[PDB]
């Protein structure tokens with residue numbers, strides 16, 4: 001699927017907190033989540049406090065992926081809205097992150113490939129003596 | 142206005158719930174799969190906000206629990222006054238409350 | 242009494258009854274045979 | 284006289300310990316009226332002390348230079364009553380308990396949910412099983428010979 | 437960063453993905469179980485290491501398996 | 517001057533050498549080739 | 550022909566990495582697909598550390614007990 | 617547009633979104649008198665070179681420290697005085 005192309009949409013009504021983007025946004029990547037709220041309502045944002053998300057499109061810039069996905073799961077489970085967040089490096093190159101196929105990762109969409117997948121039971125891994133003095137570990141054959 | 146607002150016989154007095162242990166919740170009112178069941182039984186024993194998710198039943202539980210605590214404090218006071226009655230030197234202390 | 246014998250069958254009630262009886266037994270033995278350090282009865 | 288220990292009926296330090304404790308009790312006995320109840324309890328404790336020391340005298344206890352009954356647990360018959368005659372009396376009683384609680388666990392092993400009899404003890408079944416462990420040593424012996432003592436996995 | 441390798445004992449219950457707070461895991465189609473799906477792990481670089489995936493894996497020992505490894509700022513749970 | 521030698525070396529090993537080692541190892545800690 | 554044990558056959562486990570290693574279990578169901586790697590669903594009397602009483606096992610990670 | 621109503625993600629102006637503001641950095645010109653400034657710029661230039669300042673501070677601080685400790689009489693610090701008392705015998709004669 002094509003990504004959703006993060007626009008300059010508005011943000012929630014928040015009075016400011018001490019949970020924002022300190023330096024991991026200035027020099028490293030920071031994150032941004034966008035959700036379409038059917039109505040204006042209050043929600044507990046993951047950086048501490050309580051914001052009021054607006055009707056229609058909302059946009060909230062967060063410091064790490066766990067904040068974004070925690071807020072997204074609370075949105076999808078409590079307000080039942082469809083979230084999708086990105087990762088914006090300090091030079092640009094906004095990376096589409098969460099669904100990665102349009103459908104949520106709990107659904108087995110075709111096309112996504114098997115990466116990080118061993119075709120063996122967990123106790124058939126060789127011992128560390130087999131992979132000693134080799135850059136590989138006991139779980140990468 | 143502030144009415145009385147009570148109800149009659151919400152819970153049946155019986156030893157049926159004395160028999161089955163850990164009756165007060167969903168994951169403990171099945172029986173011990175392990176020995177963690179007993180520690181989670183005693184741990185969640187007075188966690189009334191976990192048993193029933195309404196303030197009515199919670200409030201009744203803590204009210205009667207406060208009554209049990211008051212019964213215990215009165216029993217402890219009875220014990221102290223009684224041990225001061227029959228198992229004490231209170232008269233000898235009154236006679237000389239500096240060397241007794 | 243039904244379901245009271247099941248409660249009294251429970252591990253702590255049964256343990257306190259057993260250990261109260263047992264402790265009274267040991268206590269009365271130590272009253273009867275105080276200060277014991279040998280078994281001289283053979 | 285083993286291990287360089289005089290017997291306690293002959294040890295002067297043992298009698299000195301007796302006299303010291305008796306004087307320590309009598310010095311607490313003077314503060315009370317001779318007919319009063321604390322005084323009678325102290326006198327009962329005094330006779331208890333005296334007959335305790337007499338009994339440690341007559342039962343072959345050995346006293347060291349410190350003057351305290353030492354236990355000779357090696358195996359000398361003169362002192363079996365210090366360790367072995369109690370010790371067997373332990374291993375009996377202890378082996379009663381384990382032979383009971385094991386047997387109970389085998390009797391409630393074939394239930395549907397056998398864990399609700401661990402926390403709620405079947406008093407009839409437990410009372411039937413408790414006296415099975417009276418003569419437990421022959422049951423454990425035979426179960427060792429019959430192989431029923433060790434599970435075969 | 438970390439190394440979230442999964443094994444073929446997975447039954448396709450979709451509980452590790454539903455526990456994952458960083459979208460490391462995602463169910464893919466597969467033919468090795470009754471549910472006909474298995475839980476891949478593309479976004480291992482986003483793994484914090486919380487092992488909620490394997491505190492929700494209902495196998496005899498485990499199918500999803502987190503091996504802690506080189507810790508980056510994404511894997512050290514750092515908002516700064 | 518041999519009772520004065522402790523006064524030379526105890527600072528030079530205990531104050532000066534630790535400053536030298538701490539500075540040098542802090543530079544080695546933060547170096548990037 | 551139905552492969553593996555039966556839907557009530559007693560079985561023991563030869564899987565080294567399992568909680569119920571050298572412990573007997575009851576075969577709930579065997580998936581007859583010859584593409585599932587672990588078809589033998591076993592039910593055990595006692596839970597593992599994850600409070601789970603069942604897991605799918607392979608055919609060679611299992612042994613039909615003679616009791 | 618960072619200056620829109622509740623828009624804080626202008627992607628080309630990523631310094632305002634990341635928080636790259638100089639919260640107190642004043643670009644106001646030199647406040648000192650230029651002659652005082654020239655004096656300090658000429659008299660402190662020898663300390664500007666950092667590889668020659670680290671070496672200088674090391675070999676000057678260590679020198680001053682090993683010197684002022686050496687020529688410290690027995691009035692500043694008492695360790696260089698001595699016992700100044702008859703030494704008392706230890707337990708058990710001296711052992």
Ligand code: CLA
Nearest residue numbers: 180181182183184185186187188189190191203206207210
């Ligand atoms: C008015 C006083 C009061 C009240 C009504 C409560 C009520 C409650 N507390 Mg709170 N609490 C209190 C005081 C109080 N607490 C104090 C003073 C402390 C500081 C220590 C705490 C710390 C505390 C924590 C940290 C937690 C609670 C929790 C709870 C809940 C469940 C407790 C439970 O089921 O344990 C039932 C009772 C027991 C398990 C027995 C405890 C045994 C004690 C600790 C041993 C000490 C006894 C004795 C002094 C030692 C000698 C014993 C002898 C036999 C050898 C319940 C809502 C829990 C909760 O809500 O979590 C969801 C929880 O996690 N309480």
Ligand code: CLA
Nearest residue numbers: 143145200201203204205206207208209210211212214215
């Ligand atoms: C003026 C009347 C009055 C008095 C004296 C009290 C006194 C008390 N209340 Mg309160 N209460 C009142 C009115 C009153 N209440 C009203 C109107 C309400 C409804 C809004 C409540 C709701 C309330 C709650 C929800 C709780 C209490 C609790 C308590 C007890 C706290 C423990 C304490 O301090 O121990 C000091 C101990 C004593 C003074 C010994 C008490 C002995 C006498 C017999 C009882 C006091 C009179 C009482 C109201 C009963 C009247 C007669 C009755 C037959 C109707 C205390 C006894 C708490 C408690 O402990 O739970 C039991 C508790 O959880 N009360």
Ligand code: CLA
Nearest residue numbers: 152153154155156158159165201202203205206208209213
């Ligand atoms: C003998 C009379 C009787 C009977 C048959 C019942 C029966 C019942 N009660 Mg009621 N109850 C009673 C008296 C009685 N209650 C009294 C006198 C009080 C006031 C305290 C209550 C307060 C009360 C509340 C608040 C609740 C119940 C509940 C229940 C049910 C569950 C019982 C259970 O599993 O707990 C059995 C528990 C015990 C036997 C423990 C006894 C604890 C006592 C009170 C304190 C002892 C503490 C001790 C001194 C300190 C520890 C010392 C130790 C370390 C040595 C059951 C229908 C529950 C219910 O139905 O809700 C779902 C509930 O929430 N009861």
Ligand code: CLA
Nearest residue numbers: 266267268270271272274275276277278279372375376417
């Ligand atoms: C594990 C270490 C240890 C050991 C070996 C002992 C050993 C002893 N202690 Mg010490 N003690 C210990 C730990 C220990 N204690 C601890 C931890 C404490 C603090 C809690 C104490 C506190 C303590 C005190 C305060 C006292 C002792 C006393 C004693 C003596 C017990 C006399 C007695 O009453 O038994 C007599 C025998 C029994 C009670 C067993 C009877 C069992 C029943 C009746 C069944 C037997 C018959 C059976 C049916 C088989 C018959 C055969 C056939 C016909 C069927 C004994 C020398 C007492 C003593 O005399 O001091 C020396 C004493 O006053 N101990």
Ligand code: CLA
Nearest residue numbers: 366367369370371372373374375376377378379380381382
């Ligand atoms: C005051 C007296 C006293 C007290 C209170 C205890 C208390 C205890 N003893 Mg000790 N003991 C004592 C005197 C005492 N002992 C004396 C005089 C002897 C010499 C015979 C022993 C020898 C002894 C052994 C050899 C062992 C204990 C053990 C124990 C514990 C569990 C016992 C039990 O019945 O559990 C309930 C009963 C069971 C769980 C099963 C019983 C298993 C024991 C080993 C007896 C089995 C008998 C059998 C013939 C095999 C003998 C093996 C042995 C030679 C190694 C407990 C702390 C056991 C322990 O601490 O384990 C770490 C243990 O192994 N005791």
Ligand SMILES: CC1=C(/C=C/C(C)=C/C=C/C(C)=C\C=C\C=C(C)\C=C\C=C(C)\C=C\C2=C(C)CCCC2(C)C)C(C)(C)CCC1
Nearest residue numbers: 356357358366367377378379380381382383385423424432
């Ligand atoms: C005599 C004596 C002595 C010594 C001794 C010895 C040295 C011994 C050894 C011994 C040994 C070397 C032993 C071994 C054993 C082993 C085994 C292997 C066993 C087993 C057992 C069992 C198994 C049992 C069980 C049971 C019972 C029966 C009861 C309870 C329950 C139960 C089940 C637990 C001394 C000197 C001290 C002193 C003197 C006396």
Ligand code: SF4
Nearest residue numbers: 446448449450451452
């Ligand atoms: S690893 Fe866990 S969550 Fe993933 S398919 Fe297997 S059982 Fe389901």
